[PDB]
Design a binder for this molecule. Structure first.
Ligand SMILES: O=C(O)CN1CCN(C(=O)N2C[C@H](CO)C[C@H](C(=O)Nc3ccc(Cl)c(F)c3)C2)CC1
Ligand SMILES: *[C@@H]1O[C@H](CO)[C@@H](O)[C@H](O)[C@H]1NC(C)=O
Ligand SMILES: *[C@@H]1O[C@H](CO)[C@@H](O)[C@H](O)[C@H]1NC(C)=O
Ligand SMILES: *[C@@H]1O[C@H](CO)[C@@H](O)[C@H](O)[C@H]1NC(C)=O
Ligand SMILES: *[C@@H]1O[C@H](CO)[C@@H](O)[C@H](O)[C@H]1NC(C)=O
Ligand SMILES: *[C@@H]1O[C@H](CO)[C@@H](O)[C@H](O)[C@H]1NC(C)=O
Ligand SMILES: *[C@@H]1O[C@H](CO)[C@@H](O)[C@H](O)[C@H]1NC(C)=O
Ligand SMILES: *[C@@H]1O[C@H](CO)[C@@H](O)[C@H](O)[C@H]1NC(C)=O
Ligand SMILES: *[C@@H]1O[C@H](CO)[C@@H](O)[C@H](O)[C@H]1NC(C)=O
Ligand SMILES: *[C@@H]1O[C@H](CO)[C@@H](O)[C@H](O)[C@H]1NC(C)=O
Ligand SMILES: *[C@@H]1O[C@H](CO)[C@@H](O)[C@H](O)[C@H]1NC(C)=O
Length: 340
C-alpha cells in the first residue's frame, strides 16, 4: 500500500565526463548513472488518480533546470531589479540530454499507461517504476519541441477547460519538424522552415479536437494579443543563441494555394527577458557559421479568449510563459507515492 506523497528526488542521466556541453557537465556532477536494468511492475486491477497540474515532480524539475541554466548560461550583463551583475560571456556548447527523475528509498513512481489519459482524473492501467523515462528539458514558448508524442489521438490537457485563464496543452500524435537556420557569414536574421501540408493538416486535426471539447463551436486561431517578444514570438535556444520566431503564418485560419514550404522570419536576440526569474540578460553577438537546429514540434501551448460565452466561436492564441508547463508535458503520466 502507498499514500500520495512528496519527497526529494534524485536524477539519472548518461552524461559524458569529457563532453563540455553544459547539459552533460551539469548531469555529470548533479545526477547519477541511469538505472542499467530497469523493470516496471504492473499493479493488477489497480485504478489510481493523477493530477498533472498539481504534481510536485514538476516543481522539483523546474528547480533543476533553473540551476542548470544558472550554472551554464553566462551572460555578459545581467539586470535583475537594481542588480547589474557583469561577467565574461564565452560562447558555450548547448544541447539538452534526457534527464531521469528517480525516487529515494521508501517511495516509488506510479506510471499511467492509459493511452487516452488526459493528465487529470483516474487511470486503470497503472505500473510502478523507480525512475521516469529520459526527459529532455527543452526551454521554449508557444511550441513544445522534441518531446514525446501522444499515444493515440491528439490529447487536450487543461486543469479546467471551462476556466479561460488555465493554459491548454495540446499533445500531438504526429510530430511536425521545424528547421531553423542562420546562414553563414545582418547576422541576426534567421528563418524556420515548416512543411505546410504537414502543418496545416495537423492544425485541422487540432481544430476537430477543440470543437468536441467546446460544444463543436467555431474554432479560431489568432496570434498572441500583446505582450513581450518571448510571448508574442516562438522563442527557444539553438546552439546557445536565443531564437525568436514569428508564428503568424502558422495560425493562419485561412488554410487553396498554401501547400508549400512555410518560411517563418526569425531573429537571434542578445537581450532576453529571462524565464528563471524576473530580470534581463545580455549575451554576446552570435557565433559565425551556419547556426541550425532541426526539431520536432510535439505540442502546442494555447490560451483561450475570454468573454465569448455569448458568441458561437472560441478563439485560441499561442501562449507560453510558465516553463512549468513544458515540464508538465512530459511529467503528466507520473506521480510519487510513499510506499507503506
Ligand atoms: O513563475 C512565473 O510564472 C514567472 N516567472 C518569473 C519571472 N519570469 C518572467 O517575468 N517572464 C516574462 C517575460 C515576458 O513578460 C518572458 C519570460 C520568458 O519566458 N522569457 C524567455 C527567455 C528565453 C527563452 Cl528561450 C524563453 F523561451 C522564454 C517570462 C519568468 C517566470
Ligand atoms: C498497459 O500498458 C502496457 C504498457 O506498459 C501495454 O502493454 C498496454 O497498454 C496495457 N497492457 C495491459 C496488459 O493492460
Ligand atoms: C480528463 O478526464 C477526466 C475523466 O477521467 C475528466 O473529468 C476531465 O474533464 C478531462 N479533462 C479534459 C481536459 O479532457
Ligand atoms: C522526431 O520524430 C520522429 C518520429 O515522429 C522520431 O523518430 C525522432 O526521434 C524525433 N526526433 C527527435 C530529435 O526527437
Ligand atoms: C491523431 O489523432 C486524430 C484525432 O485527433 C486522428 O484523427 C488521427 O488519425 C491521429 N493520427 C495518428 C497518426 O494516429
Ligand atoms: C462565461 O463562462 C464561464 C465559465 O463557463 C461562466 O462561469 C460565466 O458565467 C460565463 N458568463 C459570464 C457573463 O461570466
Ligand atoms: C472551472 O472554471 C469555471 C470558470 O472559471 C468555474 O466556474 C468552475 O467552478 C471551475 N471548476 C473547478 C473545479 O474549479
Ligand atoms: C534544413 O534547412 C537547410 C536550409 O534551409 C537545409 O540545408 C537542410 O537540408 C534542411 N534540413 C532538413 C532536415 O530539412
Ligand atoms: C510535406 O508533407 C507531405 C504530406 O505529409 C509529404 O507528402 C511531403 O513529402 C512533404 N515534403 C514536401 C517537400 O512536400
Ligand atoms: C509577425 O509578422 C506580421 C506580418 O507578417 C507582423 O504584422 C507582426 O507584427 C509580426 N509579429 C511581431 C511580434 O512583430
Ligand atoms: C531537438 O533535437 C535535435 C536532435 O537531437 C537537436 O538537433 C535540436 O537542437 C533539438 N532542438 C532544441 C530546440 O533543443
Amino acid at each position: 500500500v502507498w499514500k500520495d506523497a512528496d519527497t526529494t528526488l534524485f536524477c539519472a542521466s548518461d552524461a559524458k565526463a569529457y563532453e563540455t556541453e553544459v547539459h552533460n557537465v551539469w548531469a555529470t556532477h548533479a545526477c547519477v548513472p541511469t538505472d542499467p536494468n530497469p523493470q516496471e511492475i504492473h499493479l493488477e486491477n489497480v485504478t489510481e488518480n493523477f493530477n498533472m497540474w498539481k504534481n510536485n515532480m514538476v516543481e522539483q524539475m523546474h528547480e533543476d533546470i533553473i540551476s542548470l541554466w544558472d550554472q551554464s548560461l553566462q551572460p555578459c550583463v545581467k539586470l535583475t531589479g537594481g542588480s547589474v551583475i557583469k561577467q565574461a560571456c564565452p560562447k558555450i556548447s548547448f544541447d539538452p540530454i534526457p534527464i531521469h527523475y528517480c525516487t529515494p528509498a521508501g517511495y516509488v513512481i506510479l506510471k499511467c499507461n492509459d493511452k487516452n489519459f488526459n493528465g487529470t482524473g483516474p487511470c486503470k492501467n497503472v505500473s510502478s517504476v523507480q525512475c521516469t523515462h529520459g526527459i529532455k528539458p527543452v526551454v521554449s514558448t508557444q511550441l513544445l519541441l522534441n518531446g514525446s508524442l501522444a499515444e493515440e489521438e491528439i490529447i487536450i490537457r487543461s486543469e479546467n477547460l471551462t476556466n479561460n485563464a488555465k493554459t491548454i496543452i495540446v499533445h500531438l500524435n504526429k510530430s511536425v519538424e521545424i528547421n531553423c537556420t542562420r546562414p553563414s557569414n545582418d547576422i541576426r536574421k534567421a528563418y524556420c522552415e515548416i512543411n505546410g501540408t504537414k502543418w496545416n493538416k495537423v492544425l485541422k486535426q487540432v481544430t476537430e479536437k477543440l470543437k468536441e471539447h467546446f460544444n463543436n463551436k467555431t474554432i479560431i486561431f489568432q496570434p498572441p494579443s500583446g505582450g513581450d517578444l518571448e510571448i508574442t514570438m516562438h522563442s527557444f535556444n539553438c546552439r546557445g543563441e536565443f531564437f525568436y520566431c514569428n508564428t503568424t503564418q502558422l495560425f493562419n485560419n485561412t488554410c487553396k494555394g498554401c501547400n508549400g514550404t512555410i518560411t517563418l522570419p526569425c531573429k537571434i536576440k542578445q537581450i532576453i527577458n529571462m524565464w528563471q526569474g524576473t530580470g534581463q540578460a545580455m549575451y554576446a553577438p552570435p557565433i559565425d557559421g551556419k547556426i541550425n537546429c532541426v526539431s520536432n514540434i510535439t505540442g502546442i501551448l494555447l490560451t483561450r479568449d475570454g468573454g465569448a460565452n455569448n458568441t458561437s466561436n472560441e478563439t485560441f492564441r499561442p501562449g507560453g510563459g510558465d516553463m512549468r508547463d513544458n515540464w508538465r508535458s512530459e511529467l503528466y503520466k507520473y506521480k510519487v507515492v510513499q510506499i507503506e
